[PDB]
Amino acid sequence: SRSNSGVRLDGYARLVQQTILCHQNPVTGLLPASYDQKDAWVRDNVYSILAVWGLGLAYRKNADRDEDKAKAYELEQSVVKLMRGLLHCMIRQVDKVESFKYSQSTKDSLHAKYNTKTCATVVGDDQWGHLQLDATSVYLLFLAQMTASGLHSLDEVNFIQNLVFYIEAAYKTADFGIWERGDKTNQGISELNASSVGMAKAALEALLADEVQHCQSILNSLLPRASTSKEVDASLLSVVSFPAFAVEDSQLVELTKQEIITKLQGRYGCCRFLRDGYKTPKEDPNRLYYEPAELKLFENIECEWPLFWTYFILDGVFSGNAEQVQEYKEALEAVLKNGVPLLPELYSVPPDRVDEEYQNPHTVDRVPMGKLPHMWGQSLYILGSLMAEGFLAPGEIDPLNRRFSTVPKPDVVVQVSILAETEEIKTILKDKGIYVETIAEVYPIRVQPARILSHIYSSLGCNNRMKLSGRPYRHMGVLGTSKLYDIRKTIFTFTPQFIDQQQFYLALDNKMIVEMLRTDLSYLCSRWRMTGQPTITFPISHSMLDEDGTSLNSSILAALRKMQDGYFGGARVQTGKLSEFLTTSCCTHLSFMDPGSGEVDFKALVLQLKEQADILYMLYTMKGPDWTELYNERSATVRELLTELYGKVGEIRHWGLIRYISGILRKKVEALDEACTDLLSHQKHLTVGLPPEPREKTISAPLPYEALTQLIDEASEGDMSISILTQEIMVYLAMYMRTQPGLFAEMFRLRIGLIIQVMATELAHSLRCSAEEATEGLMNLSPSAMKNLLHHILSGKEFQGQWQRRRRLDGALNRVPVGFYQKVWKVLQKCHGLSVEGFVLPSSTTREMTPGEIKFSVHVESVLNRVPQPEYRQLLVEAILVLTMLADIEIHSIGSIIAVEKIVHIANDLFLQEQKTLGADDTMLAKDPASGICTLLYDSAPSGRFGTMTYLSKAAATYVQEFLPHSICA
Amino acid sequence: TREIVIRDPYALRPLRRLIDAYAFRIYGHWVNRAALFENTPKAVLLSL
Ligand SMILES: C/C=C(\C)CC/C=C(\C)CCC=C(C)C
């Protein structure tokens, strides 16, 4: 090997020694960022040791002589030393890991910088924005990979598992990002970056799959966009490619790479993100933050980082390629010291040449500044060279086969065991043909609720010596409660979450349980990427039987018979005894569980209750609010009979009553924070009340269950029977996004109050009735019937007045056209802003929002979609797009903030005159008591000579006539 | 020219094609595709 491969290996040894290993501290093993930046970043240290690890691996695959063994051992032990030093850096902050485990706050996060001479902390928590889930996640990922490569106390194992819990909730934790500045605006605003989420997913996979697939949901929803305030980040290459490989969608990976190439790639590398301005000649060097008005200034002149082209060589090596264009384009290396490449950190447009670069993008000869060499980039450069020259293989750097993520994974067959709670239930199930086994017969396998599984993991990770307290109580979804568990040598199987949660009306409806089971199976068939085959334990309880008790629910039978047939829930299902499923299951072993009016005196007014059960309940709110857990003077309290009333109406299944009792007793869904976190996990915002704006409190970020529940209560303003609707509809939307997320495309802000109003309207026109009696029959809907209404609301299925209904359906669902937000970005260039109901969407937003941001989307949907009425909004949507339509033909720009409502109205006044003349009944046109827009205008089709969009075209042209006196149109 | 958009946006062809395309982008999820088209004033419509 020394003939022609040992000399080149020694050349790379000199490269790594003179670029990386020269700066490693003999005391700590950490690497200072540069001469000026003497501190050691976690992520930079982890990335900078990749070259050393790869060299050691190279040296070892050819280590036969001693000297070669000495070099390989030195390199491998340098890598081990660096990782151990970073460990004591994190170990010294065990009080921060423990605090972030429960309260994921930026003030309780691990520091990014550490003293390279003492493994201590250099700055204060307040001083750097230390929350960077990607640094800890990349450390965990490469700790898993290096160990799987043969690189070697239990206390640090407990600390590492507590770090697993630390980065476990990264799909819902705002971050300061890989660039440790949060959002682009650069005001220290913690933001959810897909880079951190993907790195956390990779670290967890290499090292509980529920939060792993939550991170997967974040990745699918966010890509190709980076985060809320970023169209694209070149750091996404660290997720869709080396080192995370956290995206298993090949199309998504290709789309993200193409977005990076098209938007950020330049002559001297790739810009980190659009309007970055980290080392641009336009920033203020001594000012830490960025004013929202200078972000425009950074456009088209952002610094291009050669570091990202090392990622483009790494993929290309990991995935075989002729991307030998990414190499050969890195001739932009500083010294050819002696001849050391010295990959720069970034290239900045020379200051004088700002105007030329702005105008002519990616064309000016930039200068190198920042760190030189960028050790994070230099290590990746050396690793890619090693890998590309045949001295290394993807399987040596990646012994965990993270690269095989993109390969299509086959559908999984979910084995289900239907277990009888009681033997009588088993007898009924058999009369009907499903042969099952009782929970007693399944012994020695012990069936437990998922609550017990969540509590068991709270004893994982605990060392009281360093004050680490297990894992926080997290709800285990279907993914967690589908593996079999080896606890104290006896196998424990756990039923899904939705079965033991019988505290809200959803569990009483057997159809709901069928629907929850179907959603769980659909989620399992797609998200199970685990060794073994998942096993859903489905016990048929006594509540699952019919009214008589000698027969089983039809819906539950039908579901079980379909599962026996192999298909239910979009999933192939194998039913059988739980004993048969031991050999082909994810039988994980939990080793931590081994031991070792008048008359205001309310003296006698409840006497009227002593049989309609509606009236009995009605009195009971007078006697609750006026008199909830107070006495009744008959060995009874207000709460007690309300619970008795709740049980009675559950037995009679008159759903309006159950909902009301639930509503005034403040029944709350336990897995509701999970529903909100799932809906927000898919990059969909939520608003909770009736539509006028203050009541409708928006949910932009995840909220803890107490807050979420409290936000729901205050959004009803005391008006009952909607606070429960918000939770129930949120749950249904979560299930439908888990199962049929295509239904939720072109939707970005779910207005629950508008949804409820549109369900009431649909119950009013279907089963024609008054809108009000329909608002009351919506109460009397079964939970599964209401879920069906929501399906039909979403998919627009029907059980001269049509176009008003559509305009309503789409507006309530807040459905926007494809490309609508980017089109709004275009008009804001022309006009000075849009005004809806007096609220202004200024053009200054575009000076800090790139068109494809999901932060500009929110800005638009907060000025436009806030309109209470469902249709008025869909018309305001048209008037914007006809404004977008006519902006292209118009050659000039106007200095007015255009009031879209007026264009809607001017079209309204243009609707009376034209229709009256074409000759239509004056009473045929009817104004709206809420919007002042003729009902027939809503009923009008979009296109045509009398189409509503044509009227707005005749309105916008007659609107901008006084603003634009002259209009040399194209 | 503006006057044409004000008077008869539809006849002028280039604009109509745009109007009809915008109708679909927004509302082709509801799709003869004619439902998205209204060439009768509701009176000649509600005549039968
Ligand atoms: C050529 C004139 C029209 C086609 C009338 C409709 C256009 C406008 C009223 C102005 C559009 C320009 C913006 C910046 C919104």
Numbering used by the authors:
A (entry chain A): 3 to 154, 158 to 212, 231 to 359, 363 to 622, 758 to 771, 778 to 794, 796 to 967, 1051 to 1221
B (entry chain C): 329 to 359, 366 to 382
Article passage:
Phosphorylase kinase (PhK) phosphorylates GP and transforms it from the inactive b form to the active a form to initiate this important biochemical process. The 1.3-megadalton PhK α4β4γ4δ4 hexadecamer consists of a tetramer of tetramer, wherein four αβγδ modules are connected by the central β4 scaffold. The α-subunit serves as a bridge between the β-subunit and the γδ subcomplex, and facilitates the γ-subunit to adopt an autoinhibited state. The γ-subunit bears the catalytic activity and consists of an N-terminal kinase domain (KD) and a C-terminal regulatory domain (CRD).
To investigate the mechanism of Ca2+-induced activation of PhK, we analyzed the cryo-EM structure of PhK in the presence of Ca2+. When compared to the inactive state structure, the most notable difference is that the KD–αJ region of the γ-subunit and calmodulin were no longer visible. Since the protein sample was intact, these regions likely displayed conformational flexibility and were not discernible after particle averaging. The majority of the AID can still be clearly observed, which remain tightly bound to the α-subunit, except for residues 360–365 that harbor the Lys361γ–Gly362γ autoinhibitory sites. The KD was likely detached from the α-subunit–AID platform as a result of this conformational change, providing an explanation for its absence in the density map. Importantly, the separation of KD from AID would lead to kinase de-inhibition and activation. However, in the presence of Ca2+, KD was not pulled down by the α-subunit after TEV cleavage, and only AID remained associated with the α-subunit. Taken together, our structural and biochemical data suggest that calmodulin likely regulates PhK activity using a spring-loaded mechanism: Ca2+-free calmodulin binds to the γ-subunit in a compact conformation, resembling a compressed spring; upon sensing Ca2+, calmodulin undergoes a conformational change and facilitates detachment of KD, thereby de-inhibiting kinase activity.
